[PDB]
């Protein structure tokens, strides 16, 4: 629905997986973040709901070493640290 504005570092992350936008819906941000996690194989192959990001740009942006995709409240707070509200 509403548009969101990634901060510069998150924008570079999104573009690095082929996004060609500066302005996004939240749905699009999640779409490209998922593609980033997939393409960089940040999830554990045997526990695919767990993302390990402590040595990746994503960890610097989200401010955690790892997270579970089941933790949606936490994921939204981590994404919003990276949006210009």
Q: What are the residues binding Cl ion (CB under 5 A)?
A: 7-9, 66
Shortest approach of Cl ion to residue 52 CB, angstroms? 8
Shortest approach of Cl ion to residue 50 CB, angstroms? 6
Return all residues near 1 (Cβ < 8 A) that are at least 6 apart: 25, 26
Question: With respect to Cl ion, which residue has the nearer C-beta, 5 or 7?
Answer: 7
Residue 61: strand, helix, or coil: helix
Shortest approach of Cl ion to residue 21 CB, angstroms? 16
Q: Are 35 and 14 in contact (CB under 8 A)?
A: no
Residue nearest to Cl ion (CB): 9
Return all residues near 17 (Cβ < 8 A) that are at least 6 apart: 32, 35, 36, 39
């Amino acid at each position: 629905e509403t548009l969101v504005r990634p901060k510069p570092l998150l924008l570079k992350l999104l573009k690095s997986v082929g996004a060609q936008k500066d302005t996004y819906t939240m749905k699009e941000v999640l779409f490209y973040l998922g593609q980033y996690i997939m393409t960089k194989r940040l999830y554990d192959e045997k526990q695919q709901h767990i993302v390990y990001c402590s040595n990746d740009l994503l960890g610097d942006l989200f401010g955690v070493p790892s997270f579970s995709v089941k933790e949606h409240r936490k994921i939204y707070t981590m994404i919003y640290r990276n949006l210009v509200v």
